[PDB]
Amino acid sequence: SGYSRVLLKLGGEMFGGGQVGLDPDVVAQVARQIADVVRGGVQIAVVIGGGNFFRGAQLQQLGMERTRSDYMGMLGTVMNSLALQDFLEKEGIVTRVQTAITMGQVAEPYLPLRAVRHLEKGRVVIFGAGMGLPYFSTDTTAAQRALEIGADVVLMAKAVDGVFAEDAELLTAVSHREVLDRGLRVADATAFSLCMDNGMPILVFNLLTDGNIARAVRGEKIGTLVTT
Amino acid sequence: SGYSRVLLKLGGEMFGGGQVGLDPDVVAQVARQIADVVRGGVQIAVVIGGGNFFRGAQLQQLGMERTRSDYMGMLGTVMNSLALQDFLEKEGIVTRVQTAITMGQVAEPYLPLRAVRHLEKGRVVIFGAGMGLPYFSTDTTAAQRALEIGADVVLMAKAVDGVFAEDPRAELLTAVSHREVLDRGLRVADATAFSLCMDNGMPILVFNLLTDGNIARAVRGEKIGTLVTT
Amino acid sequence: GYSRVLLKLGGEMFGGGQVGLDPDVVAQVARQIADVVRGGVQIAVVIGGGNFFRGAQLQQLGMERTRSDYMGMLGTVMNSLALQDFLEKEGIVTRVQTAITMGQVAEPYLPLRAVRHLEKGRVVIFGAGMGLPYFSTDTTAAQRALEIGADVVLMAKAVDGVFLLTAVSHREVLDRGLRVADATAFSLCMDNGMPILVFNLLTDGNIARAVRGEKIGTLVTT
Amino acid sequence: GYSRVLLKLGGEMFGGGQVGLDPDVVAQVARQIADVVRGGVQIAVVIGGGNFFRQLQQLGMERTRSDYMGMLGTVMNSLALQDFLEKEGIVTRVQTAITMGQVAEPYLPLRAVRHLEKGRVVIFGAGMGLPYFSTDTTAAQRALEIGADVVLMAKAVDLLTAVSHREVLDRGLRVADATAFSLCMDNGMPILVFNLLTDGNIARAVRGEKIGTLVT
Amino acid sequence: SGYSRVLLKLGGEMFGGGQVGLDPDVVAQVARQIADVVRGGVQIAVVIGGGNFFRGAQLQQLGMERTRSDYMGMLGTVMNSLALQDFLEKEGIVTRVQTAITMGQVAEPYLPLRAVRHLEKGRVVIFGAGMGLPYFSTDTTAAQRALEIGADVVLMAKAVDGVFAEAELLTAVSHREVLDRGLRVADATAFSLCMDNGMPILVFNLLTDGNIARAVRGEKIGTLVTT
Amino acid sequence: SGYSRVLLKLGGEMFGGGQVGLDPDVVAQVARQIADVVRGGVQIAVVIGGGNFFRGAQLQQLGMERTRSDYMGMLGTVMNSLALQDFLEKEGIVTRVQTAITMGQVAEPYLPLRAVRHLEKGRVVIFGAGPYFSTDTTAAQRALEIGADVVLMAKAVDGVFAEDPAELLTAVSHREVLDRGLRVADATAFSLCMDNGMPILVFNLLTDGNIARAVRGEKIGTLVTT
Ligand SMILES: O=c1ccn([C@@H]2O[C@H](COP(=O)(O)OP(=O)(O)OP(=O)(O)O)[C@@H](O)[C@H]2O)c(=O)[nH]1
Ligand SMILES: O=c1ccn([C@@H]2O[C@H](COP(=O)(O)OP(=O)(O)OP(=O)(O)O)[C@@H](O)[C@H]2O)c(=O)[nH]1
Ligand SMILES: O=c1ccn([C@@H]2O[C@H](COP(=O)(O)OP(=O)(O)OP(=O)(O)O)[C@@H](O)[C@H]2O)c(=O)[nH]1
Ligand SMILES: O=c1ccn([C@@H]2O[C@H](COP(=O)(O)OP(=O)(O)OP(=O)(O)O)[C@@H](O)[C@H]2O)c(=O)[nH]1
Ligand SMILES: O=c1ccn([C@@H]2O[C@H](COP(=O)(O)OP(=O)(O)O)[C@@H](O)[C@H]2O)c(=O)[nH]1
Ligand SMILES: O=c1ccn([C@@H]2O[C@H](COP(=O)(O)OP(=O)(O)O)[C@@H](O)[C@H]2O)c(=O)[nH]1
Ligand SMILES: O=c1ccn([C@@H]2O[C@H](COP(=O)(O)OP(=O)(O)O)[C@@H](O)[C@H]2O)c(=O)[nH]1
Ligand SMILES: O=c1ccn([C@@H]2O[C@H](COP(=O)(O)OP(=O)(O)O)[C@@H](O)[C@H]2O)c(=O)[nH]1
């Protein structure tokens, strides 16, 4: 039972708390939760999203170029990354932040072999700037990094308990292909492909209800498990 | 009578519109008013603030560490820089962005000799990431950059007409000495920004940027706003 | 006709159906890229690397895929430096950016600079794919095309088009099941409406005729 | 016997006779490294890349750019070795003379020694980091910088059982590239030419047994 | 009492020994003194001044451009930084030099997260090139580098015992009181940066053998500025 | 003669001129002599040493690691280079500082194809830096790479004497210096020129108006040519 190495995707919702900017009362709750599961010995890499600031396709619909707006939005997710790092630090947790856009003064660059040893060294690894590339999502970054750093599962942390059938019975266990056949919102379509095609399982759970991610990695039947 | 090269300081309210985030109505209007001055033949670099995302000092008081919160603030500065770049592109203006924190993929690093040479080429240089270091401000950034690139004056763009003896609810000042600002307690900039310009004789001009046509006035030498000098 | 183009070169176009480098192939490629820079087209090109290793074929031989994807990606810099040399001997100015930073071998990926190079009449070569495992070169050419703001993706093959449909909608190739490029890359093209033109490069003057706007190959367009 | 060894592997040791990569050859090359590691000797490996060429110097490429492609090819050989070692249960550390970060650790010699002392096998890819250098010279140089006891020139061929640096130069015997050989003869490194591919012959070699040809 | 992580300002006086250029006797003495406090267990980062070569404002007075002169003067600090690295290495002390103006192969760029990690590994971080920007001092660079790397105090290493009142050496002043008495501690702008963030400043005679380990243990030597 | 593009080599100890450090009174006149040349119409590239920021055999004896000791010298050349850039600009001369080690913020990297592009545009280019080589050698190599017609070794003696402690010789051949044992430049520097035909002109720099006579093709100093 259990997952030894996980990749946790935090949306911008987990930083802004719904609205724009930063909600310290959420990042605190967010950090107390990660810390509870690191003390259990799980190696946990965190991929940071950035919708509490900008989203590239949102700003392009307004008139801004998309490329320039995708960089704008990856830069927001570094700001979340520095903020998760501070709150995890007040929790006693050692952090290592890695950005896909290299910014030496601010974080070490993307080096996957070192990111894997940080974990083994018991450090929490924070991937910022997503994948570094415009026309991609942080959902897809979580799929990508999770496959490269040898994660056992991608933990899609949400503010509701799992995947329902419309917005309504919540279903606990589904095939990857079962999700697409029932037209379900599990992640990016692009992200889901990279996972399904490579057999990477995904767990959609309510990270904010107390002590749920620790339940998750112990193997308990928590949330929704997408597995092939 | 006339400034040849200028350094304009845009606070975060020129991107957030008073509020946290990005109000595209304001950058569009600021981008419109910069293009008007570029076609007039002024060389203009732009130091960009980030009040509309994070200030390190206020997050420090919420409990966050100052240095991490200051980096968050400088990262927000490049987000405003890229946004000014976009709107300034839609006005048909050629821009080079430079980040004090080095980010090859996003913008060329801070190289000051190339900066003044883009200006000579007719381009607008946008100075992102502040000074690249915590425990500083973009007001002080403007003071330093203006000095390093040989700007004739620091343009402190505000949304009011200038400095007034006493807040609001009426008496505006046209021309002040540097020591006049100090002896009277007027707020023109950071204590450090101002000291950096006063000690090196850089003039500061505080003016209402948002009234259509006014920056282009200020640069042609018009007696607009508030000029602190000598 | 097209102002900025992103041409995708597979390991076919360096190794030639065998393994390694067949310099008669590479030289003809350079010969044809040469033709279009004289034409006034801004061309950036993405280099694939199946004449050495493919990450998913080595993964089936036994090897770990991550480690093998990097092997594949270095393969493309070898192909990338090869094109550089021959295009130079055709008299063309090149500049090679790698998605995996190597400093001394080539400049890193600076996309705003890749585009000032095009504007200056130079040919930008995009090596090391996207610099990430679990991706293909076809996906790279879509991403790189949208980022440098190219008008169309030239999918260079050695057959002339796909089968010979001369113009097809983005949704019509999903509905008939024709093959144009990787499914991950095509969907990133369809979803952003980036056109893809599949054409025989190896016939003389074909690509020069493609950027000219001529009915050539198979054009996928919504 | 020998305590620390530098092993030079030609392109031949990766593609076999022909071009590209041969899993059989690489697998038996690693099987041989493994029972050596297990034997207690610290072993660092310099990797060549002749399996990615033929015609190279008949196309006219430059040598600067040419030499860099070869150097890139050695890093593909290193990653490949590292994989087949890993399946044999051997911990490795690939270093490159050309900084790459994302692919591999840079070349620091102090930190390579650290790795050997910690029981890991160091693979040196990208050669010397510069054009106009061979691999025989990278081997001669890195054997020196990490303090190896001997350079092991792994050939595919099996008779002189001992010559010396001052003895060979009188005969038409090429044991390695003349720039590499002139570095070893000048600094007192021995050179052992042997058949790596006869089963368990490198284990006998570092034990001190009469194998192949030793140059002192 | 004692300081657990410290930042040490060495002016040009501490390499040129007074005259211009470099004086190995002075530098050796300075490395001896740093080395024996690193074994004490102190994490120590050093900011290197440059008056034994160039000072921006002084070349400015001779006609030269300030901006260019400031850069001249910054490269002077790297020259000193390499000397201090050298003498400390010959004392068997692991050093790491980070330079504000990045040169790559001469030293590593400014990476502050990694500077505190060097200190935690027991290494001596040397801060060359000041802050990298014209129109600043290395006194301000120490005040800045000390706040960001988290140091407990700034050690203004002088050749005199401490801050005087023109005899009369002062053992402990408050920040506000230095400005009110017009005492000369550091820079004007360097002191403000310190005063405004509550960063203490100990001014002491580094040259008298054993004074810095003395200072670090928390003994009352020199002049301590605190609020 | 009539030299159209020249590589001027100055020993660093010239700028410190009398002591250690920098004597602005000397680099000032060096700048204004170089201006007369370019406003005359000659293209001029400059290499400067570092010997003024050290006391003679300072770090030869100090025990310093030679790689680190060399980097200290390269930094001093750049300090010397910026100081020249400044007075040459007050002389009204566009200048460009190129550094062998990339120092983006301080100057521009070394690209020789761009370096002649500067001289063609009436600008002076200044070469800093160059481990384990002397600035004599770098002057030899820059001069070759930028197509210079001649390497002007500006030294503090009138030329090359036959005996040394005589008569200063005015014209020698490349094979003649190696054979007679004459002090022209570093051995590696000299072999770089003699193996590539590159002529070398040794002349005293402290006497004013001499740089101008070198380029003009006055028969001054010692001309070494094969
Ligand atoms: O490291 C870098 C350097 C530059 N850039 C960005 O690339 C763009 C082109 O920068 P370039 O250096 O390629 O040319 P230039 O237009 O700036 O100047 P000149 O050719 O006239 O000499 C500029 O917008 C720059 O900000 C990066 O994104 N990263
Ligand atoms: O990386 C660099 C490159 C260049 N520079 C410095 O910036 C200044 C101008 O930078 P540029 O390279 O863009 O123009 P240029 O004067 O050299 O020549 P043209 O393109 O107009 O033909 C030059 O003085 C150069 O030394 C840097 O400081 N850092
Ligand atoms: O820049 C780098 C440095 C290191 N690495 C790679 O990261 C992996 C481990 O990275 P580390 O350097 O952090 O740990 P280590 O196991 O190799 O050494 P110690 O903990 O004992 O001190 C190694 O396989 C290395 O090659 C990179 O990929 N890039
Ligand atoms: O380029 C860089 C490299 C590193 N760092 C940051 O410096 C800090 C020090 O990270 P280090 O690489 O210096 O050592 P470490 O913490 O990983 O400890 P060991 O593996 O050796 O056991 C890290 O937190 C990193 O994010 C940067 O800011 N920029
Ligand atoms: O590889 C990446 C990662 C992020 N982004 C941009 O940065 C934004 C960050 O938001 P994100 O979409 O990642 O996710 P969310 O915050 O909703 O989880 C994206 O939306 C894109 O606009 C991008 O362009 N490429
Ligand atoms: O050199 C600099 C420039 C800016 N900042 C950061 O910039 C943030 C906000 O900028 P600023 O206060 O200037 O914004 P404005 O109010 O002018 O919009 C602060 O919290 C600082 O951390 C910094 O730390 N160093
Ligand atoms: O972003 C990239 C680009 C390439 N590759 C690897 O490099 C190989 C290059 O193969 P590709 O399909 O691109 O080459 P082609 O057949 O088009 O020549 C891929 O298969 C992967 O193994 C990768 O992992 N990521
Ligand atoms: O951030 C910095 C650091 C140094 N300097 C320049 O380098 C000189 C070094 O002076 P410093 O006071 O630091 O040396 P000290 O006097 O302390 O010996 C300064 O005067 C400036 O000319 C600078 O401009 N910015």
Swiss-Prot record, chain A:
Keywords of this entry: Acetylation, ATP-binding, Cytoplasm, Kinase, Nucleotide-binding, Pyrimidine biosynthesis, Transferase
Regulation: Inhibited by UTP.
Positions annotated to bind ATP: K9, L10, G11, G12, G51, R55, F164, D167
GO molecular function, one term: ATP binding
Keyword Hydrolase: no
Catalytic reaction list: UMP + ATP = UDP + ADP
Biological or metabolic pathway of the protein: Pyrimidine metabolism; CTP biosynthesis via de novo pathway; UDP from UMP (UMPK route): step 1/1
TM region positions: none
Signal peptide from the UniProt entry: none
Location, primary (coarse class): cytoplasm
Subcellular location: Cytoplasm
Keyword Cell inner membrane assigned: no
Function: Catalyzes the reversible phosphorylation of UMP to UDP.
Protein's recorded name: Uridylate kinase
Organism: Mycobacterium tuberculosis (strain ATCC 25618 / H37Rv)
Gene (UniProt): pyrH
